[PDB]
Amino acid sequence: VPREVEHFSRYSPSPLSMKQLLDFGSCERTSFAFLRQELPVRLANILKEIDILPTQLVNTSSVQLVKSWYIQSLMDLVEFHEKSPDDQKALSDFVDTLIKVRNRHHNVVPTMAQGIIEYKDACTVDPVTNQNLQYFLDRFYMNRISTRMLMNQHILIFSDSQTGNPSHIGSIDPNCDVVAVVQDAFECSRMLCDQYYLSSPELKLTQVNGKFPDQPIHIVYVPSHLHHMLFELFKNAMRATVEHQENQPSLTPIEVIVVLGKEDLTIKISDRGGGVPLRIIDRLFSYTYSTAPTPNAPLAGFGYGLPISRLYAKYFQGDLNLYSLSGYGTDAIIYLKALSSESIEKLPVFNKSAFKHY
Amino acid sequence: VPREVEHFSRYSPSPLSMKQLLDFGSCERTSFAFLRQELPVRLANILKEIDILPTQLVNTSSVQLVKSWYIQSLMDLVEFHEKSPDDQKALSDFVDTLIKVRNRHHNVVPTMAQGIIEYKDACTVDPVTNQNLQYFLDRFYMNRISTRMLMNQHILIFSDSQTGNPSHIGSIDPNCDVVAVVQDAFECSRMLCDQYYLSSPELKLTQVNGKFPDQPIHIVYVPSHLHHMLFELFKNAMRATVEHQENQPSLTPIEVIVVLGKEDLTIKISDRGGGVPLRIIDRLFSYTYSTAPLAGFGYGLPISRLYAKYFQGDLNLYSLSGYGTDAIIYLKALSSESIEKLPVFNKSAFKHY
Numbered sequence: 001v002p003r004e005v006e007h008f009s010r011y012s013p014s015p016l017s018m019k020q021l022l023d024f025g026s027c028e029r030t031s032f033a034f035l036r037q038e039l040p041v042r043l044a045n046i047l048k049e050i051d052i053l054p055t056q057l058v059n060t061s062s063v064q065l066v067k068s069w070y071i072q073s074l075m076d077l078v079e080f081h082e083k084s085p086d087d088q089k090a091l092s093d094f095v096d097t098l099i100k101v102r103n104r105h106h107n108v109v110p111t112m113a114q115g116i117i118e119y120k121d122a123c124t125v126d127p128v129t130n131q132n133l134q135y136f137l138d139r140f141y142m143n144r145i146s147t148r149m150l151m152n153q154h155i156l157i158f159s160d161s162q163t164g165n166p167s168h169i170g171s172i173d174p175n176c177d178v179v180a181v182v183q184d185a186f187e188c189s190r191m192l193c194d195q196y197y198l199s200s201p202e203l204k205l206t207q208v209n210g211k212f213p214d215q216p217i218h219i220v221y222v223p224s225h226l227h228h229m230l231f232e233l234f235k236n237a238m239r240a241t242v243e244h245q246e247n248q249p250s251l252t253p254i255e256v257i258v259v260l261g262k263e264d265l266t267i268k269i270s271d272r273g274g275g276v277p278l279r280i281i282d283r284l285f286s287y288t289y290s291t292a293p294t295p296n297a298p299l300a301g302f303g304y305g306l307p308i309s310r311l312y313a314k315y316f317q318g319d320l321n322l323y324s325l326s327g328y329g330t331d332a333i334i335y336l337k338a339l340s341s342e343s344i345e346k347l348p349v350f351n352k353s354a355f356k357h358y
Numbered sequence: 359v360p361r362e363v364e365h366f367s368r369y370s371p372s373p374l375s376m377k378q379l380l381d382f383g384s385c386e387r388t389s390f391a392f393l394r395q396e397l398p399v400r401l402a403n404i405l406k407e408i409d410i411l412p413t414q415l416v417n418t419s420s421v422q423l424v425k426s427w428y429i430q431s432l433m434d435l436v437e438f439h440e441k442s443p444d445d446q447k448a449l450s451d452f453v454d455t456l457i458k459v460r461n462r463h464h465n466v467v468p469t470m471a472q473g474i475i476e477y478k479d480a481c482t483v484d485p486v487t488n489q490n491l492q493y494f495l496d497r498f499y500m501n502r503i504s505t506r507m508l509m510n511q512h513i514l515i516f517s518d519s520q521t522g523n524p525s526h527i528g529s530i531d532p533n534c535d536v537v538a539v540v541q542d543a544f545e546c547s548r549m550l551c552d553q554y555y556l557s558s559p560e561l562k563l564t565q566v567n568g569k570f571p572d573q574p575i576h577i578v579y580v581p582s583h584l585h586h587m588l589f590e591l592f593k594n595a596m597r598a599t600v601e602h603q604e605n606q607p608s609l610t611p612i613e614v615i616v617v618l619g620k621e622d623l624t625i626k627i628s629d630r631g632g633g634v635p636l637r638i639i640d641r642l643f644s645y646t647y648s649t650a651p652l653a654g655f656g657y658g659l660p661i662s663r664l665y666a667k668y669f670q671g672d673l674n675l676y677s678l679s680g681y682g683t684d685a686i687i688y689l690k691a692l693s694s695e696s697i698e699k700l701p702v703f704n705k706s707a708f709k710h711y
């Protein structure tokens with residue numbers, strides 16, 4: 001283990017709120033000062049943790065690759081430790097380095113998932129029931145969600161060439177039109193559903209602005225994250241509805257209700273897709289668990305939709321739960337904090353405690 | 359900590375299935391041998407657990423009362439270990455003793471509740487202890503639900519003049535009409551709601567038998583337990599609906615859907631009572647959490663969840679703050695899988711504390 005990894009793994013990650021992230025777009029040297037220290041801390045924490053996985057898994061070429069990438073990115077960032085935040089050239093080179101790191105990590109999720117599979121056929125193992133593997137993957141993916149979020153925020157606000165969405169500050173939409181994201185995600189799921197079944201359920205949507213009656217619903221949020229969650233939940237609800245009702249003349253719609261309360265934004269997605277036994281609910285949330293075979297774009301198969309969507313919801317202190325009525329249908333519920341100041345990063349830390357779980 | 363208490367606490371409770379409890383009426387001497395042993399075991403296990411509580415809680419007059427009652431009952435029951443299961447007189451007296459024990463324990467819930475309230479009101483409590491009390495109360499009340507169940511099953515089936523409804527086997531209905539219980543529980547709540555609010559929401563009920571299409575929904579269950587869960591959840595939904603819609607002419611109905619699947623019987627109760635912030639959701643199940651001034655001390659949710667969990671079911675709540683709440687009950691659809699979930703005072707429990 002490189003001394004840099006050992007050293008920086010000693011610190012605990014420092015979570016930011018969405019408000020703080022927005023404010024970076026309200027100087028560059030402040031974001032530079034924070035990130036050149038924080039990214040190595042987050043990378044070092046997860047690198048130490050990778051060094052605990054089963055010999056058989058850590059040795060998969062896929063995991064070894066991811067490990068090599070994170071180490072290099074860590075080194076690239078630490079090289080900025082000497083520079084002054086007032087050094088304009090250093091700031092520019094830092095943006096270039098974040099772009100390089102972002103590009104290097106672009107295929108991390110797919111490589112790690114492939115490692116899980118290079119693990120299954122190269123060893124005897126059930127990833128679904130492997131509790132340590134599940135614990136690790138949640139932490140590994142949350143760590144990635146957080147580093148990607150932080151680097152993209154800096155790149156999209158301060159770079160010259162990458163501006164992202166004009167209406168966003170970084171990747172954050174201060175006035176996220178939730179219902180619009182819902183409608184977009186639904187249509188994306190629908191197009192996919194049609195290719196697999198030549199039919200798809202329609203959307204029945206209701207919205208209630210409890211905080212401001214009859215007003216459009218907006219909150220500060222990361223639309224790409226919201227879109228991901230909804231897309232995955234819609235794909236699930238559509239697949240279940242169509243298959244459960246394939247022997248019937250028509251399809252019941254998917255009912256969605258969007259509610260804005262004083263401190264929470266809640267989205268409920270209900271289907272009449274037959275549901276699942278309460279006994280199986282937790283399994284649904286395990287990485288790789290799927291009733292479809294492991295896989296242009298697959299409607300189902302990866303076994304990632306639920307756990308990853310839940311990570312996005314919990315990343316800023318929200319949550320995602322499934323409550324099913326076996327024999328009838330399922331209600332999927334997303335909770336998001338309605339205040340940017342309470343939307344604080346939920347980050348895994350490598351410490352005595354975490355180690356105890358392993 | 360009398361000898362019998364330490365002795366019987368050394369055995370671990372033996373959980374029975376709904377399927378086994380049905381056979382109580384198919385003999386009396388076997389049920390007698392089982393209970394004269396099992397009841398003392400369950401009482402002793404919880405009695406030892408009580409001695410682990412904070413000294414100021416244990417010394418409340420309420421906890422001391424509960425402890426003295428459980429000890430007397432344990433002794434009354436242990437006395438029967440010297441009698442023969444073939445002693446016809448011993449069998450009759452055993453039933454009389456079960457009735458005596460049931461009477462003695464009648465006030466257990468409120469009494470334990472009072473002790474907790476006094477302890478929390480007068481003493482500073484750290485997060486660890488607070489968590490331990492919730493854990494204790496869940497175990498203490500589940501323990502009482504289990505002993506009450508076993509004793510009633512024996513009395514109702516083998517008593518000379520306290521046998522109860524002939525259509526049930528003890529307190530169990532082999533063909534429980536779930537929808538009927540739902541409707542009755544709704545009405546009991548509505549009657550109370552009207553009395554206090556002068557108005558009450560209506561019921562909109564839907565039913566789906568996925569296990570046997572178009573057919574009525576029945577499962578083997580203890581109707582009084584099911585009624586308790588529904589009644590409490592209905593009172594909560596009605597109070598929330600009425601108070602949230604006070605500035606409204608009418609009241610939205612309470613929507614209920616009953617579903618029978620292969621492994622589960624599921625009941626979802628939906629209201630438009632404004633819901634609760636995500637931050638408070640977990641807190642709702644704490645015994646000391648209540649927004650009541652139709653409502654009370656905060657027992658509805660946690661006790662209802664215990665009844666659901668007692669035979670391996672569950673009770674969950676999800677809310678849409680600013681709109682309403684969905685309360686859902688899950689019960690096993692197979693009697694063979696409906697097995698008592700019992701707390702045991704072993705080293706594993708001791709450490710949890």
Ligand SMILES: Nc1ncnc2c1ncn2[C@@H]1O[C@H](COP(=O)(O)OP(=O)(O)NP(=O)(O)O)[C@@H](O)[C@H]1O
Binds near residue numbers: 236292303330
């Ligand atoms: N609304 C639903 N109704 C019934 N079953 C569901 C529902 N949602 C999820 N499931 C079950 O949970 C399993 C895993 O869901 P998920 O985690 O999203 O991965 P997947 O949909 O199977 N593969 P993918 O989404 O491509 O990563 C599904 O394959 C279903 O068996």
Ligand SMILES: Nc1ncnc2c1ncn2[C@@H]1O[C@H](COP(=O)(O)OP(=O)(O)NP(=O)(O)O)[C@@H](O)[C@H]1O
Binds near residue numbers: 629634643649653656
């Ligand atoms: N459907 C609901 N809608 C809104 N709030 C609810 C709902 N159900 C429960 N609550 C809240 O949770 C608290 C506790 O509920 P509960 O555990 O049933 O005890 P209680 O109703 O307060 N007293 P009790 O008479 O013992 O049931 C309530 O006082 C409410 O603040």
Ligand SMILES: [Mg+2]
Binds near residue numbers: 235
């Ligand atoms: Mg999916």
Ligand SMILES: [Mg+2]
Binds near residue numbers: 593594653657
């Ligand atoms: Mg109540």
